[PDB]
Amino acid sequence: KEPCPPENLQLTPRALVGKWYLRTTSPDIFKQVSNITEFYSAHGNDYYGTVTDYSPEYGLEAHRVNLTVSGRTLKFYMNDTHEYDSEYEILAVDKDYFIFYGHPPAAPSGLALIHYRQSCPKEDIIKRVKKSLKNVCLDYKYFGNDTSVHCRY
Numbered sequence: 001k002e003p004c005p006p007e008n009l010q011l012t013p014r015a016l017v018g019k020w021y022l023r024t025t026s027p028d029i030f031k032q033v034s035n036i037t038e039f040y041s042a043h044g045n046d047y048y049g050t051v052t053d054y055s056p057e058y059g060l061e062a063h064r065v066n067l068t069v070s071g072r073t074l075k076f077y078m079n080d081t082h083e084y085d086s087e088y089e090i091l092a093v094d095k096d097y098f099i100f101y102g103h104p105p106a107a108p109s110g111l112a113l114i115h116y117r118q119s120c121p122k123e124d125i126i127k128r129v130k131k132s133l134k135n136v137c138l139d140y141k142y143f144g145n146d147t148s149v150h151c152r153y
């Protein structure tokens, strides 16, 4: 679904550094690719890093990525495949998660992505996520969690 994005939310330099787990998406992508771990390093206001994942069809994958950041949006570039390469806008910022939205080739009608600091986010985090989504005209009921990993949601 299309969000109502907040036009006053901008990415703070270095906010994306470190390890993240992409555990909730809309539409649900987890039958195609799952157990997504991201690691980002700062390059000025940009980032470089890696994304590792499990694919039922391709096996274990490791990808090198770049993020170029421009205000409330960034461009995501991956080396080997470009299924998820797109501009993504920030929808919500929290100490424990970020919510992004874009229209990549893999989900060209729109893809909302929730990146968590914790590998298995607990109920208090999910409650905050639900409120963040409502604030941008989205709804957790249209999202799927990654139930391929050792986490109950």
Ligand SMILES: CCCCCC/C=C/CCCCCCCC(=O)O
Pocket (backbone or CB within 6 Å): 016, 020, 022, 033, 036, 051, 052, 053, 063, 067, 076, 078, 081, 083, 084, 088, 098, 100, 113, 115
């Ligand atoms: C928390 C910082 C997030 C910044 C990046 C926002 C967009 C991310 C897109 C991630 C794509 C997920 C790739 C899945 C693995 C694959 O199929 O290659």
